[PDB]
Enzyme design. Structure first.
Site, PDB file in Angstrom:
ATOM      1  N   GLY A  53      77.919  64.471   0.474  1.00  9.11           N
ATOM      2  CA  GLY A  53      79.238  63.908   0.271  1.00  9.11           C
ATOM      3  C   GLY A  53      80.305  64.682   1.020  1.00  9.11           C
ATOM      4  O   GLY A  53      80.074  65.756   1.573  1.00  9.11           O
ATOM      5  N   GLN A  54      81.501  64.097   1.026  1.00  8.54           N
ATOM      6  CA  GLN A  54      82.650  64.717   1.664  1.00  8.54           C
ATOM      7  C   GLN A  54      83.216  65.814   0.765  1.00  8.54           C
ATOM      8  O   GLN A  54      82.744  66.047  -0.352  1.00  8.54           O
ATOM      9  CB  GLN A  54      83.703  63.663   2.000  1.00  8.54           C
ATOM     10  CG  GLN A  54      84.269  62.930   0.794  1.00  8.54           C
ATOM     11  CD  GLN A  54      85.021  61.671   1.181  1.00  8.54           C
ATOM     12  OE1 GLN A  54      86.244  61.681   1.317  1.00  8.54           O
ATOM     13  NE2 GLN A  54      84.289  60.578   1.361  1.00  8.54           N
ATOM     14  N   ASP A  55      84.250  66.498   1.259  1.00  4.78           N
ATOM     15  CA  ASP A  55      84.766  67.679   0.571  1.00  4.78           C
ATOM     16  C   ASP A  55      85.197  67.358  -0.855  1.00  4.78           C
ATOM     17  O   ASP A  55      84.790  68.036  -1.805  1.00  4.78           O
ATOM     18  CB  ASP A  55      85.927  68.283   1.362  1.00  4.78           C
ATOM     19  CG  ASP A  55      85.459  69.137   2.524  1.00  4.78           C
ATOM     20  OD1 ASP A  55      84.231  69.285   2.699  1.00  4.78           O
ATOM     21  OD2 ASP A  55      86.317  69.663   3.261  1.00  4.78           O
ATOM     22  N   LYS A  56      86.028  66.328  -1.028  1.00  6.93           N
ATOM     23  CA  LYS A  56      86.558  66.018  -2.351  1.00  6.93           C
ATOM     24  C   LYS A  56      85.487  65.556  -3.332  1.00  6.93           C
ATOM     25  O   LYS A  56      85.786  65.416  -4.522  1.00  6.93           O
ATOM     26  CB  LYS A  56      87.651  64.954  -2.242  1.00  6.93           C
ATOM     27  CG  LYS A  56      87.142  63.570  -1.878  1.00  6.93           C
ATOM     28  CD  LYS A  56      87.937  62.979  -0.727  1.00  6.93           C
ATOM     29  CE  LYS A  56      89.430  63.091  -0.977  1.00  6.93           C
ATOM     30  NZ  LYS A  56      90.228  62.486   0.124  1.00  6.93           N
TER      31      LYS A  56
ATOM     32  N   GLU B 106      77.455  57.365  -0.880  1.00 11.62           N
ATOM     33  CA  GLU B 106      78.876  57.651  -0.711  1.00 11.62           C
ATOM     34  C   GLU B 106      79.583  56.526   0.036  1.00 11.62           C
ATOM     35  O   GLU B 106      80.678  56.104  -0.356  1.00 11.62           O
ATOM     36  CB  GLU B 106      79.062  58.979   0.024  1.00 11.62           C
ATOM     37  CG  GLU B 106      80.490  59.499   0.007  1.00 11.62           C
ATOM     38  CD  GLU B 106      80.695  60.669   0.946  1.00 11.62           C
ATOM     39  OE1 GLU B 106      80.045  60.698   2.013  1.00 11.62           O
ATOM     40  OE2 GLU B 106      81.500  61.564   0.617  1.00 11.62           O
TER      41      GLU B 106
END
Lengths: 157, 335
Positions: A53-56, B106
């Site tokens: 996943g991304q940072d947040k 995601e």
């Protein structure tokens, strides 16, 4: 290896590196959500999560960092255009204090692909001072190398 | 000509269920599908015979701009107005199989959370950071994986408070209202996230009836065509007892599976349909005969209980063979 042990491993890596393939060869309808299979090797039960996943989004995984004994990072030895973001993918995960003592197993998948020394340098493996890590050349589709790295992983745990 | 076109159509579905973008290309050239991302979004959401797993694989791609636009079009067809986030996520995942690598999950939750905010601007404005809806939806499906994955042992499953504590400070250092998370957790606890069925569901059910060692049958592209009872004939020139060698035969669009009663069935043998030939025969000892060959080379011999049983089965098999030979022709024109 007298006692049966249950351990948690986190699988990290970019999309298209071969995380699904590797996990498929080492295990009904999969539960909705993230891949998480069991890997039993030499009287050790490995619950293996596919993480990313991304940072947040990353801090949502911290709940699962507490009981994490091993990290499996899969890199596409052929995607030289993405090796630098693979390094960022690996390093951002290794920046979590909750994962400080986990051991690192790197599957160099798809062996004009980069060799082990090339990936060790581009992934910055030798910059990890207090980390127990190992890089294993593997072909995910042919099952080659998968259990040698699993040998190293279990011997370390 | 009419049967040949529904055949070419099914070929398009098969190709999508193996590599979706090749099926999209196929159906477009043959004139079955509009080439705009909104037409593909309607096709994906509506047409039966599409692997919801492969729909996810296609929509989840974060590198192709066409796949992303199709995904944006797909969520624009859904209305999440005045729905709990988990409920809206359940409706979204009921169409697409939201399961796989963390990056694919995601991308799908991403487009879904964007659509949910458009559908609920007021409630979303009640948050310090609208990124909360996305982070929360991600956490919702993560709770579903944790709570219902057989591979996550009971003792290590995330309890309600572990869930609330895992979301602390998400909203620009503030918390999500606690009473809300408790509602999300309880609802997920009362109903696991579950995809709508597709054609792979019927093959999975045949896989369950078969006990013991077996080939992997429920591949995304495989569709169940026919269930039939036949008698295997080891020697068509000699008689056999009444009802001997009774088989439970399963005809798929690209595979013939022969089993016997073990209701439970023991797997005996499977045959591909490429190069497979078929001829009906009737002599003194076998009135409803079926002989399968390969090109020539006898694969197996059957005797149907009735001629309607042979007529129905033989018809399905003749079409599945022709369909498979179309797949070969295309699968070699791959320059």
């Amino acid at each position: 290896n007298l006692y049966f042990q249950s351990m948690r491993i986190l699988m990290v890596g970019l999309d298209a590196a071969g995380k699904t393939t590797i996990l498929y060869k080492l295990k009904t309808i999969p539960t909705i959500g993230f891949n998480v299979e069991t890997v039993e090797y030499k009287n050790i039960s490995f619950t293996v999560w596919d993480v990313g996943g991304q940072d947040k989004i990353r801090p949502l995984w911290r709940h699962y960092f507490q009981n994490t004994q091993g990290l499996i990072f899969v890199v596409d030895s052929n995607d030289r255009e993405r090796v630098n973001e693979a390094r960022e993918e690996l390093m951002r995960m290794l920046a979590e204090d909750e994962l400080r003592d986990a051991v690192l197993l790197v599957f160099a998948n798809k062996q004009n692909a980069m060799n082990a020394a090339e990936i060790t340098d581009k992934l910055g493996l030798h910059s990890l001072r207090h980390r127990n890590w190992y890089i294993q050349a593997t072909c995910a589709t042919s099952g080659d190398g998968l259990y040698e790295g699993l040998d190293w992983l279990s011997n370390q745990l | 000509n009419d049967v040949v076109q529904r055949r070419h159509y099914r070929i398009g579905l098969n190709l999508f269920n193996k590599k979706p973008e090749k099926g999209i290309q196929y159906l477009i050239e043959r004139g079955f599908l509009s080439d705009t991302p909104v037409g593909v979004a309607h096709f994906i959401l509506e047409r039966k015979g599409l692997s919801r797993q492969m729909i996810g694989e296609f929509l989840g791609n974060r590198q192709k701009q066409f796949n992303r636009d199709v995904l944006d079009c797909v969520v624009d067809e859904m209305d999440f107005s005045s729905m709990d986030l988990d409920d809206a996520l359940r409706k979204f995942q009921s169409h697409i199989r939201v399961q796989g690598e963390a990056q694919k999950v995601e991308r799908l939750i991403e487009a879904f959370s964007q659509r949910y905010c458009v559908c609920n601007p007021a409630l979303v404005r009640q948050f310090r950071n609208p990124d909360t809806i996305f982070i929360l939806a991600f956490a919702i499906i993560l709770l579903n994986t944790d709570m219902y994955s057989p591979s996550v042992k009971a003792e290590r499953k995330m309890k309600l408070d572990d869930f609330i504590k895992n979301l602390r400070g998400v909203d620009n250092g503030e918390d999500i209202p606690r009473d809300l998370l408790v509602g999300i957790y309880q609802r997920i606890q009362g109903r696991e996230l579950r995809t709508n069925d597709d054609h792979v569901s019927q093959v999975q059910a045949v896989e369950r009836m078969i006990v013991g060692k077996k080939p992997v049958l429920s591949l995304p592209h495989r569709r169940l065509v026919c269930c039939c009872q036949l008698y295997e004939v080891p020697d068509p020139n000699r008689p056999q007892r009444l009802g001997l060698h009774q088989r439970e035969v399963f005809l798929f669009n690209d595979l013939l599976v022969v089993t016997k009663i073990f209701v439970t069935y023991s797997f005996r043998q499977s045959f591909p349909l490429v190069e497979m030939h078929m001829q009906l025969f009737q002599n003194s000892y076998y009135q409803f005969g079926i002989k399968l060959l390969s090109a020539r080379k006898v694969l197996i011999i059957f005797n149907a209980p009735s001629l309607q049983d042979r007529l129905r089965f033989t018809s399905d098999l003749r079409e599945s063979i022709a369909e498979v030979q179309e797949m070969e022709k295309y699968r070699v024109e791959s320059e």
